[PDB]
Assembly symmetry: none
Amino acid sequence: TVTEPVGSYARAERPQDFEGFVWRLDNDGKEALPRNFRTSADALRAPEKKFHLDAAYVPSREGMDALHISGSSAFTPAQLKNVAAKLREKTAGPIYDVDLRQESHGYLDGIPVSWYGERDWANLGKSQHEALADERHRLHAALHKTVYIAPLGKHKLPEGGEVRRVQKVQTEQEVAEAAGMRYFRIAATDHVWPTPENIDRFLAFYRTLPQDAWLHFHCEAGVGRTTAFMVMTDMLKNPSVSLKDILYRQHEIGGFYYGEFPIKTKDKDSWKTKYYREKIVMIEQFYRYVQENRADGYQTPWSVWLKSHPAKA
Amino acid sequence: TVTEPVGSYARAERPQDFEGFVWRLDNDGKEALPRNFRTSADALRAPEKKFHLDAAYVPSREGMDALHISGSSAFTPAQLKNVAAKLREKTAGPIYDVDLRQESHGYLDGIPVSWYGERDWANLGKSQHEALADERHRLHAALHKTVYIAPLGKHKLPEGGEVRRVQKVQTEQEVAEAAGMRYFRIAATDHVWPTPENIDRFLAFYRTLPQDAWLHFHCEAGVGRTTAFMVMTDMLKNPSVSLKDILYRQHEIGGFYYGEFPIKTKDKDSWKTKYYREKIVMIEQFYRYVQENRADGYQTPWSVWLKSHPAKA
């Protein structure tokens, strides 16, 4: 009897110890584009030293021209419009804003904010239905009320910021539509491998996309969640490409590197270590799922297949 | 107390361990031109992936139209005539066959051959006078004798070939003069940075050239020595062009890339690694010599300046 299988370690954490406490500023809006903006059309750059990769290695670009995906961190409405314009120069198909954030977030007076709890786990353990209900209620409750919006500084705690009486509230779905993008939400918890529920939902969505759909994935800050789904999409769409090439190329266009590397954390972030190790194991298991299930058109869902073929630490 | 300074690493190798053992076929004469033929008038191509350069970078072509240089690997007499005809269409000045090969080579019954030792180091350690004496003696000794001429295969050892009784012997100087080209020899060792003597000789020669001289450099196989001297010439003649532009453009017309890149060799070629690193450092040092000594007309030669301004690994 195993309480939590590999790929589900976060289920052991207690949601009540990470409840939200502040409206975090997701982007100050000073730049034209959100941070970490990158597309599959981009040239590959040298790998980051931290990953101890082979800088001489030349990854195959097989399928990258037709992949049609991009990623970025959070954005203001104006930044999303800039992203949409850039992507429209690359395709005539529908462009999707694939929101990978489980945390409740939205726009107050056009300012992108999120209800932040320790480790960005304010919605940990909630079903997507529950997470979205929390978001809807919180955003609506902010209208015509005074709120404190702040960036996180020293030790992931509020520092500075501003206080305002909100006159307009918008969901990301509304902002996406205003930018001419379709919207699709996958409520994935920050810092951990996406759940079987998250991936099942993504795969079902992937299956009904028109051939020319362009997927723009985004998370809050960094490249963890976006890279996981960009890697999964690359594997699904280009199954003949080696795991090494997929992992190297998604890292070299600006994402995270999801293969083995010497994990090193500050004491303050030692809790992240097992989650990084879990992600490495799970990306390999997903690759196995794609290889073993593509032939019959993925008749067996990832969640079902993973229960019969559990990953090992 | 340093035994061998940077730029002179090859002096630590033992010549007795690389003595010549076969007449290597330098070109089978099946094509109209030698391999790697390129001129400074050529359009720039995308960079080779192994150098991990910026494919979007467009180097300045400032001065290329007036540079008047070309390079190629070894050739048969007929191929050299083809090259000479092609170059004559581009200039009315003297066209020089600048022979950069230290290894003894010539033509037996019109077949281009070289006396090959491991690493193509059969003349390593010999002064230019001694290398040329060896060449003359070896070529003459072949007349009216049976010789084995072969291309190198797998582990850089003879494979196939032919056996013939030689009825005619010619030096490259004779073949060049028959193609209508002037001849100049610089005995440079294959695979390593040219010696201070090699470079002093080239610069003294460069200073004697009329304005409209065209220099055709050639080596044995590949683009190592030819690119080194083409880069030196470009730096001398176009001193206002950035180091980056010189290196990118000489690579992009078909030569080697002499800037920093992630060096990767097959296990059997690992001995080459430090010589590649040495070349990178020395190219920068030569650029410094040009920048520091052009203003006064090079009153101090490279060898002297290099001893007072040694390069650092």
